[PDB]
Amino acid sequence: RRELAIEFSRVTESAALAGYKWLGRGDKNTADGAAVNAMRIMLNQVNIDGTIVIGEGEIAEAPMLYIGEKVGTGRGDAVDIAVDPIEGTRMTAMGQANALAVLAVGDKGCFLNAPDMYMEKLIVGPGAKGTIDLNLPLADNLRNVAAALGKPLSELTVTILAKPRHDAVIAEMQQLGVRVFAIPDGDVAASILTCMPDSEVDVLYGIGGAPEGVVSAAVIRALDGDMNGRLLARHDVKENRRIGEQELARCKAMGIEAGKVLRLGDMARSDNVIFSATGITKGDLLEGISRKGNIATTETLLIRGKSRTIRRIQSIHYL
Ligand SMILES: O=P(O)(O)OC[C@H]1O[C@](O)(COP(=O)(O)O)[C@@H](O)[C@@H]1O
């Protein structure tokens, strides 16, 4: 499957390019719809027998890249697919930094199927692999990570979604003497920073999308870091109890129990993962698309769990 790595990077490049057309145009859903459409089109020309496992939603409210959709030419291997055609849709609509197009491809059955609900995440890179456990308190995890990283706590840097749900815990960490990078959106890209040496980020902690968590699980596994997650029902996080109760019903069926700590391998089950991400706007991880005349440029991160060549591909496209 390593011959397909380039094909997959083309899938994100094309989703990025299509989402870029809608940058700064104040329309979340048209930008997203364009990226989705372009990603599906590209994936349907790749020689895989793909099943969308993480995607735009159920068949009833997502016509494209719905959960269980078959993609690819059907030649090649049966593979699980996680798509996030635009991570940072609001940012794309507003012309802000950190928008990117995301894809992960793995072995059949490789990715946890969990509902579109919230997940508490704790993520670190290779130097702190094995030092984390979400059953312990945050403070304990943080000291353990700092100690394994070989730095004082006060030097430790934690990134976290800047959201109301997170005020209490951001205070607790600042009080504890930790540097807190609060980001507006995008915990998929931010989790990868834990494994990028020239990023000051050591740790991602906090509650974001469950499907995003499973994509971070896959790439974090590929990069040999570590992650724990914990599914949480809407009302435990924020008539939320209405949607929170179907999430728990969906959990029983799926069949997983919320509130239990997922280890790395509970979410990303093998090392055979190809991860691809292409920047739409510039961010901590990737350069944005530039476009002068009939010539556009993209930067793509391409990671394959079987190895460690981490690839950054700078493409010059003649449209
Ligand atoms: O905004 P919420 O509801 O707190 O969701 C958090 C999730 O949204 C994201 O920030 C993506 O944002 P977008 O929905 O604008 O694409 C993810 O990175 C994160 O997991």
Which residue's alpha carbon is at the smallest distance from atom 10 of ligand 1? 185
Say if residue 265 carries a ligand binding annotation.
no
Residues ≥6 apart with Cβ < 8 Å to 315: 13, 297, 298, 299, 300
85 lines ligand 1 (CB under 6 A): no
Residues ≥6 apart with Cβ < 8 Å to 75: 47, 48, 49
Q: How far apart are CA 240 and CA 236, in angstroms?
A: 9
CB atoms within 10 A of CB 138: 18
120 lines ligand 1 (CB under 6 A): no
Domain boundaries, the chain: 1-108+272-319, 109-271
Helices and strands per DSSP (H, E), number in the chain: 10, 14
185 lines ligand 1 (CB under 6 A): yes
Method: X-ray
Q: Among 3.40.50.720, 3.30.70.3340, 1.10.645.10, 3.40.190.90, what is the CATH number of 109-271? A: 3.40.190.90
Burial of 44 (0-12, 13-18, 19+ CB in 10 A): middle
H runs (alpha helix) in 85-209: 89-94, 138-149, 167-175, 187-193
CB atoms within 10 A of CB 224: 15
DSSP character at residue 151: S
Say if residue 291 carries a ligand binding annotation.
no
Q: Which residues share a beta bridge with 124?
A: 203, 226
Q: How far apart are CA 239 and CA 118, in angstroms?
A: 16
Q: What is the CATH number of domain 1-108+272-319?
A: 3.30.540.10
Residue 11: what are its φ and ψ, rounded to 5°? Answer: -65, -45
The C-alpha R_g of the chain, in whole angstroms, comes to 19
Look at residue 97 and give its three-state secondary structure. Answer: coil
206 lines ligand 1 (CB under 6 A): no
